Protein backbone atom coordinates (compact mmCIF):
# COMPACT_ATOMS: atom_id res chain seq x y z
CA UNK A 559 0.00 0.00 0.00
CA UNK A 560 1.51 3.38 -0.98
CA UNK A 561 1.83 6.16 1.67
CA UNK A 562 0.66 3.96 4.57
CA UNK A 563 1.40 6.69 7.20
CA UNK A 564 -0.98 9.07 5.26
CA UNK A 565 1.57 11.86 4.91
CA UNK A 566 0.78 14.98 2.89
CA UNK A 567 2.62 14.56 -0.43
CA UNK A 568 4.07 17.40 -2.55
CA UNK A 569 4.21 17.06 -6.35
CA UNK A 570 6.32 18.91 -8.94
CA UNK A 571 4.81 18.08 -12.39
CA UNK A 572 6.71 19.01 -15.51
CA UNK A 573 4.97 21.15 -18.16
CA UNK A 574 4.31 17.97 -20.09
CA UNK A 575 2.74 16.28 -17.10
CA UNK A 576 0.60 19.43 -16.48
CA UNK A 577 -1.42 18.94 -19.66
CA UNK A 578 -3.81 16.28 -18.65
CA UNK A 579 -5.51 17.11 -15.30
CA UNK A 580 -7.43 13.83 -14.82
CA UNK A 581 -4.38 11.75 -15.64
CA UNK A 582 -2.25 13.66 -13.05
CA UNK A 583 -4.87 13.21 -10.28
CA UNK A 584 -4.88 9.49 -11.02
CA UNK A 585 -1.06 9.48 -10.90
CA UNK A 586 -1.01 11.17 -7.51
CA UNK A 587 -3.47 8.59 -6.20
CA UNK A 588 -1.25 5.76 -7.62
CA UNK A 589 1.42 7.11 -5.27
CA UNK A 590 -0.95 7.14 -2.24
CA UNK A 591 -1.54 10.88 -2.10
CA UNK A 592 -5.22 10.55 -1.23
CA UNK A 593 -4.50 8.67 1.94
CA UNK A 594 -3.49 12.02 3.57
CA UNK A 595 -6.74 13.80 2.56
CA UNK A 596 -4.68 16.69 1.09
CA UNK A 597 -1.80 17.11 -1.46
CA UNK A 598 0.23 20.10 -2.65
CA UNK A 599 0.98 20.62 -6.36
CA UNK A 600 3.71 23.10 -7.33
CA UNK A 601 3.09 24.15 -10.99
CA UNK A 602 5.93 23.93 -13.57
CA UNK A 603 8.11 27.02 -13.64
CA UNK A 604 6.87 27.93 -17.14
CA UNK A 605 3.21 28.12 -16.06
CA UNK A 606 1.23 31.12 -14.95
CA UNK A 607 -2.43 31.63 -13.98
CA UNK A 608 -2.58 35.06 -15.57
CA UNK A 609 -0.14 37.85 -16.54
CA UNK A 610 -0.58 40.15 -13.56
CA UNK A 611 -2.87 40.88 -10.57
CA UNK A 612 -2.65 44.64 -11.11
CA UNK A 613 -6.22 45.14 -12.10
CA UNK A 614 -8.35 43.25 -9.39
CA UNK A 615 -9.23 46.04 -7.02
CA UNK A 616 -12.63 46.67 -8.47
CA UNK A 617 -13.99 43.15 -7.82
CA UNK A 618 -16.87 43.51 -5.34
CA UNK A 619 -17.19 41.58 -2.14
CA UNK A 620 -21.01 41.98 -1.83
CA UNK A 621 -21.29 40.34 1.58
CA UNK A 622 -18.07 40.35 3.63
CA UNK A 623 -18.36 38.06 6.66
CA UNK A 624 -17.09 39.01 10.17
CA UNK A 625 -16.10 35.76 11.86
CA UNK A 626 -17.06 35.99 15.54
CA UNK A 627 -15.81 33.20 17.84
CA UNK A 628 -17.30 31.60 21.01
CA UNK A 629 -15.67 29.04 23.25
CA UNK A 630 -12.10 28.47 24.39
CA UNK A 631 -8.88 29.05 22.45
CA UNK A 632 -8.53 25.47 21.23
CA UNK A 633 -12.24 24.52 20.97
CA UNK A 634 -14.56 27.17 19.51
CA UNK A 635 -17.30 27.88 17.07
CA UNK A 636 -17.59 30.85 14.74
CA UNK A 637 -20.59 32.63 13.32
CA UNK A 638 -20.64 34.86 10.35
CA UNK A 639 -21.98 38.38 10.71
CA UNK A 640 -22.80 40.02 7.39
CA UNK A 641 -21.13 43.39 6.72
CA UNK A 642 -21.67 46.09 4.13
CA UNK A 643 -20.25 45.58 0.62
CA UNK A 644 -16.76 46.62 -0.22
CA UNK A 645 -14.36 46.37 -3.17
CA UNK A 646 -11.24 44.20 -3.11
CA UNK A 647 -9.17 47.47 -2.96
CA UNK A 648 -11.13 48.56 0.10
CA UNK A 649 -10.81 45.09 1.71
CA UNK A 650 -7.04 45.00 1.10
CA UNK A 651 -6.66 48.37 2.82
CA UNK A 652 -8.72 47.05 5.74
CA UNK A 653 -6.63 43.85 5.99
CA UNK A 654 -3.43 46.03 6.15
CA UNK A 655 -4.81 48.33 8.89
CA UNK A 656 -3.36 48.31 12.33
CA UNK A 657 -6.56 46.60 13.71
CA UNK A 658 -6.42 43.66 11.25
CA UNK A 659 -2.83 43.24 10.01
CA UNK A 660 -0.54 40.25 10.61
CA UNK A 661 1.55 40.78 13.79
CA UNK A 662 5.28 40.64 13.90
CA UNK A 663 6.46 37.06 13.97
CA UNK A 664 9.60 34.95 13.49
CA UNK A 665 8.44 32.24 11.12
CA UNK A 666 5.27 30.25 10.15
CA UNK A 667 5.45 28.21 13.40
CA UNK A 668 5.51 31.32 15.61
CA UNK A 669 2.55 32.68 13.60
CA UNK A 670 0.66 29.41 14.06
CA UNK A 671 1.24 29.63 17.82
CA UNK A 672 -0.11 33.18 17.86
CA UNK A 673 -3.17 32.14 15.80
CA UNK A 674 -4.18 29.40 18.25
CA UNK A 675 -3.47 31.51 21.31
CA UNK A 676 -5.26 34.58 20.14
CA UNK A 677 -7.80 33.86 17.40
CA UNK A 678 -10.88 33.85 19.59
CA UNK A 679 -10.20 37.39 20.83
CA UNK A 680 -10.58 38.94 17.43
CA UNK A 681 -13.20 38.95 14.63
CA UNK A 682 -11.47 39.06 11.18
CA UNK A 683 -13.50 39.77 8.02
CA UNK A 684 -13.48 37.10 5.22
CA UNK A 685 -14.56 37.75 1.57
CA UNK A 686 -15.60 34.15 0.99
CA UNK A 687 -17.59 32.29 -1.53
CA UNK A 688 -17.64 34.87 -4.41
CA UNK A 689 -18.61 33.29 -7.78
CA UNK A 690 -15.91 34.03 -10.35
CA UNK A 691 -12.40 33.28 -11.64
CA UNK A 692 -9.00 34.95 -11.91
CA UNK A 693 -7.55 32.48 -14.46
CA UNK A 694 -6.87 34.02 -17.86
CA UNK A 695 -9.01 32.37 -20.51
CA UNK A 696 -5.88 31.62 -22.42
CA UNK A 697 -4.39 29.54 -19.57
CA UNK A 698 -4.97 26.04 -20.81
CA UNK A 699 -3.47 23.92 -18.00
CA UNK A 700 -5.09 23.62 -14.56
CA UNK A 701 -7.50 26.44 -15.24
CA UNK A 702 -10.13 25.97 -12.49
CA UNK A 703 -12.85 27.55 -14.69
CA UNK A 704 -12.24 24.94 -17.49
CA UNK A 705 -12.41 21.67 -15.60
CA UNK A 706 -14.66 18.71 -16.57
CA UNK A 707 -17.93 19.14 -14.64
CA UNK A 708 -19.22 16.87 -11.85
CA UNK A 709 -22.47 16.44 -13.77
CA UNK A 710 -20.57 15.19 -16.79
CA UNK A 711 -18.54 12.79 -14.55
CA UNK A 712 -21.75 11.36 -13.06
CA UNK A 713 -23.15 10.96 -16.56
CA UNK A 714 -20.06 9.24 -17.87
CA UNK A 715 -19.86 6.83 -14.91
CA UNK A 716 -23.51 6.11 -14.26
CA UNK A 717 -25.31 6.95 -17.53
CA UNK A 718 -27.75 9.45 -16.05
CA UNK A 719 -27.99 13.02 -17.33
CA UNK A 720 -28.71 15.60 -14.65
CA UNK A 721 -29.27 19.37 -14.32
CA UNK A 722 -26.75 21.61 -12.56
CA UNK A 723 -23.57 23.53 -13.09
CA UNK A 724 -20.09 23.58 -11.43
CA UNK A 725 -18.28 27.01 -11.24
CA UNK A 726 -15.35 28.36 -9.20
CA UNK A 727 -15.34 30.61 -6.20
CA UNK A 728 -12.99 33.34 -4.98
CA UNK A 729 -11.87 33.84 -1.36
CA UNK A 730 -10.31 37.08 -0.15
CA UNK A 731 -8.66 36.57 3.29
CA UNK A 732 -6.89 38.47 6.00
CA UNK A 733 -4.94 37.54 9.13
CA UNK A 734 -6.93 35.06 11.29
CA UNK A 735 -9.66 34.40 8.74
CA UNK A 736 -10.63 30.82 9.35
CA UNK A 737 -12.10 27.81 7.57
CA UNK A 738 -13.80 25.43 9.98
CA UNK A 739 -13.47 21.61 10.04
CA UNK A 740 -15.36 20.10 7.09
CA UNK A 741 -15.44 17.77 4.18
CA UNK A 742 -16.73 18.95 0.83
CA UNK A 743 -20.39 18.79 -0.22
CA UNK A 744 -21.21 15.20 -1.09
CA UNK A 745 -17.60 14.32 0.00
CA UNK A 746 -16.31 15.68 -3.36
CA UNK A 747 -12.72 16.59 -4.11
CA UNK A 748 -11.69 20.24 -3.99
CA UNK A 749 -8.86 22.09 -5.69
CA UNK A 750 -7.63 25.42 -4.38
CA UNK A 751 -5.17 27.81 -6.05
CA UNK A 752 -3.55 30.61 -3.97
CA UNK A 753 -3.40 33.41 -6.56
CA UNK A 754 -1.63 36.05 -4.50
CA UNK A 755 -0.70 37.35 -1.13
CA UNK A 756 0.11 35.75 2.18
CA UNK A 757 0.02 32.03 3.01
CA UNK A 758 -2.79 29.71 4.10
CA UNK A 759 -2.13 26.98 6.74
CA UNK A 760 -4.09 23.74 6.42
CA UNK A 761 -4.87 20.90 8.83
CA UNK A 762 -6.23 17.57 7.52
CA UNK A 763 -7.43 14.19 8.85
CA UNK A 764 -6.80 11.11 6.65
CA UNK A 765 -10.08 9.87 5.08
CA UNK A 766 -9.66 6.46 6.68
CA UNK A 767 -9.77 8.18 10.09
CA UNK A 768 -12.49 10.73 9.52
CA UNK A 769 -14.95 9.06 11.91
CA UNK A 770 -12.40 9.60 14.77
CA UNK A 771 -12.64 13.31 14.18
CA UNK A 772 -16.47 13.09 14.08
CA UNK A 773 -16.56 11.26 17.41
CA UNK A 774 -14.34 13.86 19.04
CA UNK A 775 -16.46 16.67 17.61
CA UNK A 776 -19.63 15.10 19.09
CA UNK A 777 -17.90 15.07 22.51
CA UNK A 778 -16.60 18.65 22.23
CA UNK A 779 -19.75 20.22 20.79
CA UNK A 780 -22.44 18.19 22.56
CA UNK A 781 -25.47 20.55 22.02
CA UNK A 782 -24.61 20.87 18.31
CA UNK A 783 -24.38 17.09 18.02
CA UNK A 784 -27.88 16.65 19.52
CA UNK A 785 -29.22 19.24 17.07
CA UNK A 786 -27.91 17.52 13.95
CA UNK A 787 -26.42 14.17 13.06
CA UNK A 788 -23.98 15.83 10.61
CA UNK A 789 -23.31 19.17 12.22
CA UNK A 790 -19.81 19.53 10.80
CA UNK A 791 -21.68 20.29 7.55
CA UNK A 792 -22.51 23.62 9.16
CA UNK A 793 -18.88 24.62 8.84
CA UNK A 794 -18.62 26.37 12.22
CA UNK A 795 -16.43 24.21 14.50
CA UNK A 796 -12.74 24.63 15.21
CA UNK A 797 -10.47 22.27 17.15
CA UNK A 798 -6.73 23.08 17.56
CA UNK A 799 -3.83 20.81 16.80
CA UNK A 800 -3.00 20.63 20.49
CA UNK A 801 -6.49 19.37 21.29
CA UNK A 802 -6.37 16.86 18.41
CA UNK A 803 -2.98 15.56 19.72
CA UNK A 804 -4.35 15.31 23.30
CA UNK A 805 -7.20 13.17 21.98
CA UNK A 806 -5.08 10.95 19.71
CA UNK A 807 -6.67 12.09 16.41
CA UNK A 808 -4.42 11.43 13.42
CA UNK A 809 -3.79 14.63 11.37
CA UNK A 810 -1.22 16.53 9.36
CA UNK A 811 -0.49 20.19 8.63
CA UNK A 812 1.04 22.13 5.77
CA UNK A 813 1.32 25.78 4.65
CA UNK A 814 0.31 26.77 1.09
CA UNK A 815 2.05 29.77 -0.50
CA UNK A 816 1.06 31.98 -3.38
CA UNK A 817 1.40 30.14 -6.70
CA UNK A 818 0.63 26.71 -5.28
CA UNK A 819 -2.34 24.33 -5.65
CA UNK A 820 -3.86 22.17 -2.93
CA UNK A 821 -6.17 19.20 -3.62
CA UNK A 822 -8.49 17.82 -0.98
CA UNK A 823 -9.63 14.23 -1.45
CA UNK A 824 -13.05 12.66 -0.78
CA UNK A 825 -13.89 12.58 2.92
CA UNK A 826 -10.65 14.40 3.90
CA UNK A 827 -11.63 16.66 6.80
CA UNK A 828 -9.76 19.95 6.66
CA UNK A 829 -9.56 23.32 8.48
CA UNK A 830 -7.12 26.24 8.47
CA UNK A 831 -6.41 29.95 8.52
CA UNK A 832 -4.91 32.77 6.45
CA UNK A 833 -1.69 34.56 7.39
CA UNK A 834 -2.58 37.95 5.96
CA UNK A 835 -4.23 39.51 2.88
CA UNK A 836 -4.64 36.89 0.15
CA UNK A 837 -6.83 35.66 -2.67
CA UNK A 838 -7.60 32.01 -3.40
CA UNK A 839 -9.81 30.31 -6.04
CA UNK A 840 -11.40 26.91 -5.44
CA UNK A 841 -13.85 24.51 -7.02
CA UNK A 842 -15.20 21.01 -6.38
CA UNK A 843 -14.56 18.17 -8.81
CA UNK A 844 -15.14 14.44 -9.12
CA UNK A 845 -13.34 11.35 -10.51
CA UNK A 846 -14.60 7.77 -10.85
CA UNK A 847 -13.25 6.99 -7.41
CA UNK A 848 -15.51 9.65 -5.82
CA UNK A 849 -18.79 7.91 -6.76
CA UNK A 850 -18.68 5.51 -3.84
CA UNK A 851 -17.97 8.36 -1.41
CA UNK A 852 -20.83 10.37 -2.79
CA UNK A 853 -23.21 7.46 -2.15
CA UNK A 854 -22.12 7.29 1.49
CA UNK A 855 -21.80 10.99 2.31
CA UNK A 856 -23.55 12.25 5.41
CA UNK A 857 -26.04 14.84 5.20
CA UNK A 858 -27.41 17.74 7.29
CA UNK A 859 -31.24 17.64 7.23
CA UNK A 860 -31.70 20.11 10.31
CA UNK A 861 -31.80 22.85 7.85
CA UNK A 862 -28.71 24.76 8.83
CA UNK A 863 -26.26 23.64 6.05
CA UNK A 864 -28.33 25.02 3.15
CA UNK A 865 -26.34 24.37 -0.07
CA UNK A 866 -26.31 24.78 -3.88
CA UNK A 867 -28.84 23.96 -6.54
CA UNK A 868 -26.53 21.30 -8.04
CA UNK A 869 -26.37 19.21 -4.88
CA UNK A 870 -30.08 18.30 -5.36
CA UNK A 871 -29.39 15.99 -8.22
CA UNK A 872 -26.43 14.38 -6.52
CA UNK A 873 -28.60 13.43 -3.55
CA UNK A 874 -31.51 12.39 -5.73
CA UNK A 875 -29.47 9.99 -7.86
CA UNK A 876 -26.84 8.73 -5.40
CA UNK A 877 -28.90 8.76 -2.20
CA UNK A 878 -32.59 8.25 -3.18
CA UNK A 879 -33.61 6.99 0.31
CA UNK A 880 -32.26 10.20 1.93
CA UNK A 881 -33.74 12.46 -0.76
CA UNK A 882 -37.15 13.29 0.78
CA UNK A 883 -35.74 14.09 4.29
CA UNK A 884 -32.70 16.08 3.00
CA UNK A 885 -35.00 18.17 0.75
CA UNK A 886 -37.32 18.93 3.74
CA UNK A 887 -34.15 20.44 5.32
CA UNK A 888 -33.43 22.42 2.13
CA UNK A 889 -37.08 23.76 1.97
Ligand SMILES: O=C(O)CNC(=O)C(=O)O
Pocket residue numbers: 729736737748749750822828838840841
Ligand atom coordinates in the same frame (compact mmCIF):
# COMPACT_ATOMS: atom_id res chain seq x y z
O1 LIG B 1 -9.69 28.61 1.38
C1 LIG B 1 -10.70 28.45 2.16
O2 LIG B 1 -11.18 29.37 2.99
C2 LIG B 1 -11.47 27.21 2.30
N1 LIG B 1 -11.13 26.30 1.15
C3 LIG B 1 -11.47 25.02 1.15
O3 LIG B 1 -12.09 24.45 2.15
C4 LIG B 1 -11.18 24.22 -0.08
O4 LIG B 1 -10.55 24.66 -1.02
O5 LIG B 1 -11.72 23.07 0.01
Ligand SMILES: [Mg+2]
Pocket residue numbers: 613614615616617
Ligand atom coordinates in the same frame (compact mmCIF):
# COMPACT_ATOMS: atom_id res chain seq x y z
MG1 LIG C 1 -11.06 45.05 -10.80
Ligand code: NI
Pocket residue numbers: 740741742748822828
Ligand atom coordinates in the same frame (compact mmCIF):
# COMPACT_ATOMS: atom_id res chain seq x y z
NI1 NI D 1 -12.95 22.68 1.68
Ligand SMILES: [Zn+2]
Pocket residue numbers: 785786787788789791792858859860861862863
Ligand atom coordinates in the same frame (compact mmCIF):
# COMPACT_ATOMS: atom_id res chain seq x y z
ZN1 LIG E 1 -27.60 20.33 10.40
